[PDB]
Design an enzyme around this catalytic site. Structure first.
Site, PDB file in Angstrom:
ATOM      1  N   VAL C  77      -3.184  -0.080  -0.079  1.00  0.00           N
ATOM      2  CA  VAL C  77      -3.131   1.247   0.523  1.00  0.00           C
ATOM      3  C   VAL C  77      -3.764   2.231  -0.451  1.00  0.00           C
ATOM      4  CG1 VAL C  77      -1.619   3.052   1.433  1.00  0.00           C
ATOM      5  CG2 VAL C  77      -1.030   0.650   1.782  1.00  0.00           C
ATOM      6  N   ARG C  83       3.801   5.331  -0.754  1.00  0.00           N
ATOM      7  CA  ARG C  83       5.208   5.755  -0.673  1.00  0.00           C
ATOM      8  C   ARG C  83       5.522   6.489   0.629  1.00  0.00           C
ATOM      9  NH1 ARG C  83       3.546   2.419  -4.316  1.00  0.00           N
ATOM     10  NH2 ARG C  83       4.883   2.208  -6.167  1.00  0.00           N
ATOM     11  N   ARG C  84       4.918   6.022   1.726  1.00  0.00           N
ATOM     12  CA  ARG C  84       5.147   6.590   3.045  1.00  0.00           C
ATOM     13  C   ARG C  84       5.565   5.506   4.029  1.00  0.00           C
ATOM     14  NH1 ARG C  84      -0.305  10.542   3.250  1.00  0.00           N
ATOM     15  NH2 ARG C  84       0.222  11.662   1.315  1.00  0.00           N
ATOM     16  N   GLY C  85       5.888   4.308   3.543  1.00  0.00           N
ATOM     17  CA  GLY C  85       6.289   3.206   4.396  1.00  0.00           C
ATOM     18  C   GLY C  85       5.161   2.425   5.031  1.00  0.00           C
ATOM     19  N   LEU C  87       2.907   0.092   3.744  1.00  0.00           N
ATOM     20  CA  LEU C  87       2.919  -1.340   3.457  1.00  0.00           C
ATOM     21  C   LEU C  87       4.043  -2.045   4.204  1.00  0.00           C
ATOM     22  CD1 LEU C  87       2.019  -3.835   2.033  1.00  0.00           C
ATOM     23  CD2 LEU C  87       3.442  -3.223   0.084  1.00  0.00           C
ATOM     24  N   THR C  88       5.236  -1.447   4.218  1.00  0.00           N
ATOM     25  CA  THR C  88       6.343  -2.033   4.964  1.00  0.00           C
ATOM     26  C   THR C  88       5.981  -2.185   6.436  1.00  0.00           C
ATOM     27  OG1 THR C  88       7.864  -0.999   3.395  1.00  0.00           O
ATOM     28  CG2 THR C  88       8.786  -1.839   5.448  1.00  0.00           C
ATOM     29  N   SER C 111      -0.343  -8.846  -7.096  1.00  0.00           N
ATOM     30  CA  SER C 111      -0.915  -8.062  -8.182  1.00  0.00           C
ATOM     31  C   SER C 111       0.175  -7.484  -9.074  1.00  0.00           C
ATOM     32  CB  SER C 111      -1.772  -6.939  -7.609  1.00  0.00           C
ATOM     33  OG  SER C 111      -0.970  -6.037  -6.868  1.00  0.00           O
ATOM     34  N   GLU C 112       1.324  -7.146  -8.492  1.00  0.00           N
ATOM     35  CA  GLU C 112       2.505  -6.701  -9.218  1.00  0.00           C
ATOM     36  C   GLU C 112       3.703  -7.500  -8.730  1.00  0.00           C
ATOM     37  OE1 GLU C 112       2.116  -2.458  -8.554  1.00  0.00           O
ATOM     38  OE2 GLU C 112       2.545  -2.007 -10.651  1.00  0.00           O
ATOM     39  N   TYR C 116       6.837  -7.712  -3.348  1.00  0.00           N
ATOM     40  CA  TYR C 116       6.982  -8.509  -2.138  1.00  0.00           C
ATOM     41  C   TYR C 116       8.348  -9.157  -1.934  1.00  0.00           C
ATOM     42  CZ  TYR C 116       1.952  -7.854  -1.717  1.00  0.00           C
ATOM     43  OH  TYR C 116       0.698  -7.306  -1.619  1.00  0.00           O
ATOM     44  N   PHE C 388      -6.440 -16.626  -3.711  1.00  0.00           N
ATOM     45  CA  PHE C 388      -7.059 -15.965  -2.581  1.00  0.00           C
ATOM     46  C   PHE C 388      -6.536 -14.547  -2.509  1.00  0.00           C
ATOM     47  CE2 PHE C 388      -3.438 -18.508  -1.282  1.00  0.00           C
ATOM     48  CZ  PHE C 388      -2.634 -17.597  -0.625  1.00  0.00           C
TER      49      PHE C 388
HETATM   50  C1  LIG Z   1      -1.592 -10.100  -1.650  1.00  0.00           C
HETATM   51  C2  LIG Z   1      -2.250  -9.045  -2.489  1.00  0.00           C
HETATM   52  O1  LIG Z   1      -3.434  -8.780  -2.346  1.00  0.00           O
HETATM   53  S1  LIG Z   1      -1.341  -8.230  -3.636  1.00  0.00           S
HETATM   54  C3  LIG Z   1      -2.281  -6.749  -3.798  1.00  0.00           C
HETATM   55  C4  LIG Z   1      -1.372  -5.536  -3.635  1.00  0.00           C
HETATM   56  N1  LIG Z   1      -2.128  -4.302  -3.735  1.00  0.00           N
HETATM   57  C5  LIG Z   1      -2.095  -3.502  -4.801  1.00  0.00           C
HETATM   58  O2  LIG Z   1      -1.390  -3.704  -5.780  1.00  0.00           O
HETATM   59  C6  LIG Z   1      -2.997  -2.289  -4.718  1.00  0.00           C
HETATM   60  C7  LIG Z   1      -2.390  -1.025  -5.316  1.00  0.00           C
HETATM   61  N2  LIG Z   1      -1.204  -0.568  -4.611  1.00  0.00           N
HETATM   62  C8  LIG Z   1      -1.172  -0.227  -3.323  1.00  0.00           C
HETATM   63  O3  LIG Z   1      -2.148  -0.263  -2.593  1.00  0.00           O
HETATM   64  C9  LIG Z   1       0.147   0.248  -2.778  1.00  0.00           C
HETATM   65  O4  LIG Z   1       0.871   0.904  -3.824  1.00  0.00           O
HETATM   66  C10 LIG Z   1       1.009  -0.887  -2.225  1.00  0.00           C
HETATM   67  C11 LIG Z   1       0.244  -1.684  -1.179  1.00  0.00           C
HETATM   68  C12 LIG Z   1       1.447  -1.797  -3.363  1.00  0.00           C
HETATM   69  C13 LIG Z   1       2.255  -0.267  -1.612  1.00  0.00           C
HETATM   70  O5  LIG Z   1       1.906   0.538  -0.484  1.00  0.00           O
HETATM   71  P1  LIG Z   1       2.967   1.624   0.052  1.00  0.00           P
HETATM   72  O6  LIG Z   1       2.491   2.208   1.361  1.00  0.00           O
HETATM   73  O7  LIG Z   1       3.095   2.713  -0.990  1.00  0.00           O
HETATM   74  O8  LIG Z   1       4.397   0.897   0.259  1.00  0.00           O
HETATM   75  P2  LIG Z   1       5.812   1.369   0.878  1.00  0.00           P
HETATM   76  O9  LIG Z   1       5.813   2.870   1.062  1.00  0.00           O
HETATM   77  O10 LIG Z   1       6.095   0.644   2.176  1.00  0.00           O
HETATM   78  O11 LIG Z   1       6.963   1.002  -0.173  1.00  0.00           O
HETATM   79  C14 LIG Z   1       8.079   0.198   0.197  1.00  0.00           C
HETATM   80  C15 LIG Z   1       9.012   0.054  -1.003  1.00  0.00           C
HETATM   81  O12 LIG Z   1       8.407  -0.750  -2.008  1.00  0.00           O
HETATM   82  C16 LIG Z   1       8.293   0.016  -3.200  1.00  0.00           C
HETATM   83  N3  LIG Z   1       6.989  -0.259  -3.847  1.00  0.00           N
HETATM   84  C17 LIG Z   1       5.809  -0.385  -3.217  1.00  0.00           C
HETATM   85  N4  LIG Z   1       4.838  -0.628  -4.125  1.00  0.00           N
HETATM   86  C18 LIG Z   1       5.430  -0.657  -5.335  1.00  0.00           C
HETATM   87  C19 LIG Z   1       4.919  -0.872  -6.713  1.00  0.00           C
HETATM   88  N5  LIG Z   1       3.600  -1.102  -6.929  1.00  0.00           N
HETATM   89  N6  LIG Z   1       5.804  -0.830  -7.734  1.00  0.00           N
HETATM   90  C20 LIG Z   1       7.091  -0.598  -7.446  1.00  0.00           C
HETATM   91  N7  LIG Z   1       7.626  -0.395  -6.238  1.00  0.00           N
HETATM   92  C21 LIG Z   1       6.796  -0.421  -5.160  1.00  0.00           C
HETATM   93  C22 LIG Z   1       8.363   1.489  -2.811  1.00  0.00           C
HETATM   94  O13 LIG Z   1       8.939   2.271  -3.861  1.00  0.00           O
HETATM   95  C23 LIG Z   1       9.343   1.395  -1.647  1.00  0.00           C
HETATM   96  O14 LIG Z   1      10.652   1.294  -2.189  1.00  0.00           O
HETATM   97  P3  LIG Z   1      11.849   2.172  -1.583  1.00  0.00           P
HETATM   98  O15 LIG Z   1      11.999   1.810  -0.123  1.00  0.00           O
HETATM   99  O16 LIG Z   1      13.101   1.853  -2.366  1.00  0.00           O
HETATM  100  O17 LIG Z   1      11.494   3.633  -1.730  1.00  0.00           O
END
Ligand SMILES: CC(=O)SCCNC(=O)CCNC(=O)[C@H](O)C(C)(C)COP(=O)(O)OP(=O)(O)OC[C@H]1O[C@@H](n2cnc3c(N)ncnc32)[C@H](O)[C@@H]1OP(=O)(O)O
Ligand SMILES: CC(=O)SCCNC(=O)CCNC(=O)[C@H](O)C(C)(C)COP(=O)(O)OP(=O)(O)OC[C@H]1O[C@@H](n2cnc3c(N)ncnc32)[C@H](O)[C@@H]1OP(=O)(O)O
Ligand SMILES: CC(=O)SCCNC(=O)CCNC(=O)[C@H](O)C(C)(C)COP(=O)(O)OP(=O)(O)OC[C@H]1O[C@@H](n2cnc3c(N)ncnc32)[C@H](O)[C@@H]1OP(=O)(O)O
Ligand SMILES: CC(=O)SCCNC(=O)CCNC(=O)[C@H](O)C(C)(C)COP(=O)(O)OP(=O)(O)OC[C@H]1O[C@@H](n2cnc3c(N)ncnc32)[C@H](O)[C@@H]1OP(=O)(O)O
Lengths: 388, 389, 388, 386
Positions: C77, C83-85, C87-88, C111-112, C116, C388
């Site tokens: 994202v 932090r707007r839901g 990914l969920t 990646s982190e 998941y 992948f």
């Molecule tokens: C399979 C793969 O390719 S893995 C690659 C993953 N992508 C990346 O790391 C790219 C960089 N990061 C991003 O694009 C985004 O930060 C994402 C995809 C990790 C998260 O997208 P978001 O829209 O912000 O996620 P969302 O709002 O649904 O968060 C859901 C919960 O997970 C938590 N969360 C999401 N990402 C993270 C993170 N990187 N570190 C810690 N907590 C996280 C949020 O705090 C939230 O917790 P809460 O409900 O207690 O407040």
């Protein structure tokens, strides 16, 4: 099963390059890099799986004489055919062929130091790497550098080959046209092009290091890959050019002679640090009698050296060595040594006392060692500023 | 400013603190145990002792094996509140003149900075090397007999090791007086890691294990050899062979050692022996050039006439005909001209005339004059001391 | 305010790639590398600002069965919409869509490590990196190698894909044609081309490292990026080939299974050092019952495992697991666990005792943990060796 | 020439210590059990030796078997490569057999020495570095039962807590072991913190105290974590994660399957900093060892064991959850005693050793059936060195 013959077609020559590159594993243009008629091949069941090549060259022996030299290289066997005596078959055939060509020595640069001594090759010269902290390197005596001329981008491989050709230092080896063509390719592969500064009697090539971070709060360093100096004035002038180069913090010279008088040029000898010492010339005396006669000695009494040579039994004999005459003798020897250790002493890079200390020389009197060292001593450590 | 010899023990104690101040970063014993009573020069401004220079009665082995009268110069230093005022020059001038009057012909030191002593005629005459051996790759090229080897670790004494060292015959070797052994008794007491001492009928070797708190760590168990004394080729191979066969050792570090130590020739894998560093060692000062040149041996060459320049000691500023047969003062035109500092560099065989000529420190009047001189002065082994003071 | 739909145009697919790269920050035609109809997009006020993709794949579970697997990737994202839901919303739709496709497991490379598990993904496999000191690595038992063949330039991407297709190790995943095309791009960009050595039942790819400084007094290292061996004989022969490379000082294998029997192949097990261990497969059980039924178990007594699943309530039930039958039950459970931790054990990469020690498994009967480990125990650690 | 006998006076034992220290070369500078130290004498001078301690070892199933804690092995460099160690080991193992002990284990200084004598690597240890700032617990961790006992800790009190050790691979810590660690603790100016739980304890020491109050990474080192219950384990680890001034927590040696990564929301806060061989296990009585361990409810497998030093183990054994007896039936699996020792504690499987070429199978499912019997839930681990 295994057949050792000379390569004879362009197809065989190209395959030997693929085989040699494969054996080296990690080495970084097609057959304009070879000399036709000297490449040996190892064939098992038809396919070429190893080889050994050489170039027609010369080698400067003590006294300045330029002896016929076979620059051996391209040695390698595929890992699917190792530990079967194939290299031994190649080396034995190669040395016999080198002998028949009238060549007196053969030399190489060993990829591993545990391979070639069993075949009579001895470590005859070594090289050093110097790091000069330029801020501390003010000259002890004044250095001229008036004849220095910048030739950076206008330098050509043909011009530097003309300057190198008059090389007279002991250990120097011929640089054929094929060698300069190979370094034309190395120069093209490196994006940083080298500076070339010339003197009427020499030149110096140097390249800047980590250029993307030059203005950083670190040591702006240059690297000198070739320093050719045919005169004391050229040596001091060329080195003086580096010591006076602005913005340079560290000067790296390598490979250089192990006795390069760099520490004696500066008021602070510790501004020059030896960053490493490595074996260089692996020399193989092919015709021991002819080699001993081509070199010069001091006005000492003759000493009789008994040489052991298993691959080349023609060299297994006793030789009376003196500044006046070198002859085969049946007189009782003063020293007995194998041809590999004799090669180590031949260019002056080792003495008879130190090889005896390692257990590689058998003396009949404690003063026989002194007499032999008195004859063989040289003023400069040998050094081959060239790799192949 | 008054330059006189120290006399009272209080002055000797104060000179030690003054020397320690000058060295800044050097690591409780009475000064008399480490000093020679009649040999410490002092520099006095007003009543205050602010600098000094000391020496020991010693010998030095020159090419040919002769053991020459040698002044082991040390303890040189001036307080930072009195530097750049000619005090060291006054000390060195008085010291060298006094060394001459004692009948000693050479003086040597270990320089803390390489930019200090050449102006007084001292030249770098020997160098030392540091080797790191990868023991697993260091199988002997020829079999090495280690049957005469004896373990003497805790039973070794400073008096017993001094008896073995006394027979030192290599060029550059220097005397180890009792004061030198007393000093190393203190260094061993300060180090909690005690050294192993292995002996041979003709030599010994001291070695100490490094990072013992992490000995069983991943890898790189290293030992350090601080002294390897070998009076024979057989003793040399046995002592080194003992090191190459020591179980649990991964890396063997030798230092300081001669720059031409034949370690690469003892092993099937010369690259198992790596040179980790090279440093200047002996800063040699020829006090009586004629007596020094006459005490060493030369090869059966033609005589060479060397014109020597000496500013501090004009007695040496002359022309000397050097040959294996006779060394005499001459009025004949010289073949080679050199200052006493560079002559000191060549004197022990640690440098050649060609290389110093290349650096601009030797002037030749004939092309073959340099070649003739190197033919005379050449030696088979690089000079080496292996002892510091 | 936020709309989640599948992408349907090449323009949208190309932007979803730009969004994914932007989200990854430091990651180095797209329709050739993508599988259509599987990429979800997150649109806010019309513009595409995030997405989540997957590939049709399989996954080898204990017992050798090859289950339908969704290789999830391309999740990201834009930082202006975190932090707007979103990914969920992406993961919930994706897993529900994966379920409708009849696929029972989904896996990814995180990646982190903090992302998941809240969605039911559990760390099911880990990988290790080995550095072998070749001089110390003489084989404990003789290793044959006549069937070894050098195929460096004669190797084809299609031929290695044919060899990989026979993968039977637990945790192995499909390498679709799109995956090999992607690795064709990586290989073309690197000027150092890899060696490819084959065995009738496997292959190994390796590359030399710092080739410009190969001949220096620094450990010449090779890097093995893929080791495929479908038999014990192929494994020993391929590894034995590496141990016998004459110029190589250090061999780096990675990623490899955490229980790779390298230390047992050599007389000196300490010649093999583990340079690092990292999580690999993030496994998500989509159909818990179908997954538990597709894998094999030992001849033990049935244990009832109560699985907790918030995103997919179809899995929130109690399952009686035994070597004979896997059924839904209303009987009191022997073990309670969330689906994330069940995924960690599912491939054999974790045991029930250790997860209970971490507080992720609750036992309701004495010996239930001991009984469960007996059924789920496996002889090999799961491993993918594919990213992948 | 060379005489191998047990030492008989304390004067001989004391020199055997100096000889062992000499052979060890770089080991730092009462501690022995009399009647277990073998010595090698050439002309009345002691030039080598091998010692052992009366101990126990926890095998799968919890059973505590008679164990010989081998140590003090060493030969002077002037007498190596003459068969003296082989003579010492042969005499030692036969003596261990006569005492009724079924296993012997050691910590090898070099991994290339003891396999020729039947010793196999049975356990390994790992070193973890935890980035404390990232190590928040995945589930809430209680800690009310945590009590600070730093300076009030005693060797006698901590030994009482360790005595309840039940994890596979654990070995006895005799009084001589605690006396030896009393000496190590007195030499170190940094005294260790000791925090207790009703079912365990943890010792930790700050690293580089001279630059603690202002540096890059304030790290503490845990040298011993004894936890006899899941609750004690989480409480002790939770105590470490909640220490306010610590940036990095270094645990070592620990089990290779320590569930630290599963305690934190960020598994990558826990990094494996290294893995090393630990227990070199030598099965002295193979049949009695196979009988002291537990197995799963599987079908019997016949294992043919090869043992050159101890021919009593050279036989075929039918292993099952009900009975372990010698049989003459054709074997399903063939192994040398060294590789059998590697599997015995659960630190290795039959598939992986067969893949390495150390196990030969006579049936397709024999390897799979054997792993079904021998499988364990925890990797073996000996939190103790000697
Ligand atoms: C399979 C793969 O390719 S893995 C690659 C993953 N992508 C990346 O790391 C790219 C960089 N990061 C991003 O694009 C985004 O930060 C994402 C995809 C990790 C998260 O997208 P978001 O829209 O912000 O996620 P969302 O709002 O649904 O968060 C859901 C919960 O997970 C938590 N969360 C999401 N990402 C993270 C993170 N990187 N570190 C810690 N907590 C996280 C949020 O705090 C939230 O917790 P809460 O409900 O207690 O407040
Ligand atoms: C001038 C140059 O180009 S240097 C380049 C050298 N080439 C390389 O390093 C490429 C990689 N290596 C190879 O191709 C091969 O290993 C070679 C050519 C070095 C050796 O080929 P082989 O057919 O295996 O040699 P061969 O069977 O004749 O061995 C002869 C002896 O030398 C020993 N030996 C040969 N190569 C090596 C080596 N690399 N390391 C150690 N020992 C060696 C063998 O053990 C044997 O000893 P033995 O008689 O006691 O049993
Ligand atoms: C054998 C041994 O123990 S070596 C130990 C030597 N002692 C030390 O290094 C201690 C630290 N240094 C000192 O105590 C002082 O600087 C000394 C003793 C080296 C010099 O004392 P000074 O009173 O300053 O010497 P002095 O005034 O006679 O200087 C003579 C020349 O040498 C030069 N010189 C002296 N010391 C140094 C130095 N450390 N670095 C550079 N140049 C120096 C002076 O510049 C002067 O040169 P100039 O004639 O062109 O102006
Ligand atoms: C439990 C503990 O305390 S572990 C402590 C072990 N002790 C040490 O590491 C101290 C340092 N090493 C030593 O003292 C000696 O080298 C010992 C004790 C390891 C071996 O003593 P030795 O008398 O030389 O053993 P021995 O002659 O019986 O050798 C038997 C075989 O093992 C081999 N071997 C023995 N030690 C070693 C070693 N350190 N490295 C490699 N191989 C060895 C020998 O080559 C021989 O093999 P071979 O039959 O094929 O020729």
């Amino acid at each position: 099963v295994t057949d050792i013959r000379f390569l004879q077609s362009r197809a065989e020559h190209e395959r030997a390059f693929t085989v040699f590159w494969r054996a080296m594993v990690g080495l970084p243009a097609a057959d304009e890099l070879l000399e036709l008629g000297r490449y040996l091949g190892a064939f098992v069941q038809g396919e070429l799986i190893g080889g050994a090549d050489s170039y027609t060259s010369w080698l400067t022996v003590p006294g300045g004489s330029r002896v016929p030299h076979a620059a051996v290289t391209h040695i390698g066997v595929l890992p699917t055919h190792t530990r079967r005596g194939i290299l031994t078959a190649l080396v034995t055939r190669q040395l016999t062929d080198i002998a028949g060509r009238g060549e007196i020595v053969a030399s190489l640069r060993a990829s591993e130091a545990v391979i070639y001594r069993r075949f009579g090759y001895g470590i005859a010269t070594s090289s050093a790497t110097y790091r000069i902290q330029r801020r501390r390197a003010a000259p002890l005596r004044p250095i001229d550098t008036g004849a220095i001329a910048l030739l950076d981008a206008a330098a050509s491989p043909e011009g530097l080959a003309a300057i190198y050709e008059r090389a007279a230092w002991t250990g120097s080896v011929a640089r054929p046209p094929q060698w300069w063509r190979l370094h034309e390719l190395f120069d093209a592969a490196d994006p940083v092009k080298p500076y070339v500064v010339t003197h009427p009697d020499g030149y110096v090539r140097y390249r800047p290091q980590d250029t993307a971070e030059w203005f950083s709060s670190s040591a702006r360093t240059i690297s000198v890959d070739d320093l050719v100096a045919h005169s004391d004035e050229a040596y001091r002038a060329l080195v003086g050019h580096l010591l006076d180069l602005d913005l340079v913090d560290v000067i790296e010279l390598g490979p250089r002679p192990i006795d390069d008088p760099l520490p004696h040029l500066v008021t602070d000898p510790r501004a020059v640090a030896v960053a490493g010492i490595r074996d260089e010339t692996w020399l193989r005396l092919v015709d021991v009698e002819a080699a001993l006669a081509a070199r010069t000695y001091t006005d000492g009494a003759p000493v009789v050296i008994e040489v052991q040579d298993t691959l080349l039994p023609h060299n297994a004999a006793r030789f009376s060595v003196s500044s006046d005459k070198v002859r085969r003798t049946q007189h009782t020897p003063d020293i007995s040594v194998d041809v590999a250790a004799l090669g180590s002493v031949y260019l002056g890079g080792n003495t008879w006392t130190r090889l005896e200390r390692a257990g590689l020389v058998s003396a009949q009197s404690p003063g026989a060692i002194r007499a032999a060292d008195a004859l063989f001593s040289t003023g400069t450590q040998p050094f081959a500023g060239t790799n192949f």
